[PDB]
Structure 1
């Protein structure tokens, strides 16, 4: 409980068929599949009514095909995925086609010609300036995640071993380092705002975490230098 999907982040090469899954809330008669791309609203795909598809209007290409044999678990597969498949596929469930919908985390998909384009984030943290401290009596830390592809990252701050959400302001979505080039890396920034009295404490430890989702184990890698797999990149600094 409630609606969960898997995987949440999946990067694949063109011509490589993939598969997604969704486990709706128990006791939900209906099930929906959507597609968000280019920032556009959820574009309908298919409809499941008690393990039975009663609507397939949203499906553009026949390469896609979802099945719900168990009646409580659905699986959408895409044979020979292409670039126009690079989007976020959502899943919804309800007591019926006449009730409100519950959405899951979704599945962010990104297809590429070569898997050599995958790269981990370059995380770095900066300290608050003396100007900001003496003026507002508050300190703001900056985290930067750069040179990472695709834009599959989850940034979070960790003060004294524990994650914080208060005063945390992160960018809505990663920005391409070079918007011109069709294939470009992404960047990201975040801001943690604490009191000047808090930052001026050496005891306090501040760390910026960036959960990156790359290639899994079942993916072969040739390049001799490292391997962009699902990893995390952080940067820390002590108070003054």
Structure 2
């Protein structure tokens, strides 16, 4: 397996950031990549083994270290907004071609001028269209999260307490509304019969990752740290 830590991170320009990769595949090769919307997966640094690292295709602005076989770290001494991106780690057996690689879950890193912009989301649940119910035989619930920044969020659905992916349709990526505000919507379709049973519970769960304990927030104002907001509704 390959894990990455932290999975979410907001940093201020000029700050120092460290992404850590851990593997249990006992592979000699490890890699650090970055991916940017519409753009490709680019290699930053890689390593053929403990105690050494190699410059990738876009090394400028990053340092790397391989303290052991299991770990591979990517260091950003002076974070810049241009380093905002989604970082991927991977281990590789054999020669290290893609077919022999195993990627991590990814890390979302956002670098801004200051943290006073970070804001938790607004979550709302909406009942199926009046008409849609009748000659639709299908009931569709729409979940909307907005006014959040940056865009490190996860949206899931829970019917009767059990997570569901069937009938779900979530926007592939959070879309920006204003300069400092994102929006994200999703839909859950069920049989109009299911939506009419007062025994059925509907829940839209949203998780927002903001600032961390390690971060220092200007005292006097509530610190926008991670949050778990949920909108619910019963069957009518």
Partner of 2:26: 27
Partner of 2:63: 65
Partner of 2:107: 107
Partner of 1:46: 45
Secondary structure in 2 matching 1:128: coil
Q: Deviations over 1:120-153 (max 9, x none)?
A: 0100000001211112201000111000000100
Q: Contact 2:53–2:64 at 8 Å: present in 1 too?
A: no
TM-score, scaled relative to structure 2: 0.94
What is the CA-CA distance between 1:96 and the residue it aligns to?
2.6
Alignment of 1:81-100 (within 5 A): 81-99=79-97, 100=100
What is the CA-CA distance between 1:207 and the residue it aligns to?
0.7
Partner of 1:77: 75
Q: Contact 1:3–1:22 at 8 Å: present in 2 too?
A: yes
What is the CA-CA distance between 1:54 and the residue it aligns to?
5.5
User: How many residues align structurally?
Assistant: 234
Match of residue 204, structure 1, among 200, 203, 215: 200
Alignment of 1:60-209 (within 5 A): 60-61=59-60, 63-99=61-97, 100-178=100-178, 183-209=179-205
What is the CA-CA distance between 1:184 and the residue it aligns to?
2.1
Match of residue 232, structure 1, among 207, 216, 228: 228
TM-score, scaled relative to structure 1: 0.93
Partner of 2:210: 214
Q: Deviations over 1:11-56 (max 9, x none)?
A: 1111111111111232212111111123311111112111254530
Unaligned runs of 5+ in 1: none
Q: CA RMSD in A?
A: 1.5
Counterparts of 1:115 and 1:148 in 2: how far apart (Å)? 13
Counterparts of 1:79 and 1:40 in 2: how far apart (Å)? 24
Cα 1:25–1:206, aligned 2, differ >3 Å: closer, same or farther? same
Counterparts of 2:149 and 2:220 in 1: how far apart (Å)? 18
What is the CA-CA distance between 1:223 and the residue it aligns to?
5.9
What is the CA-CA distance between 1:79 and the residue it aligns to?
0.9
Does residue 1:55 correspond to 2:54, yes or no? yes
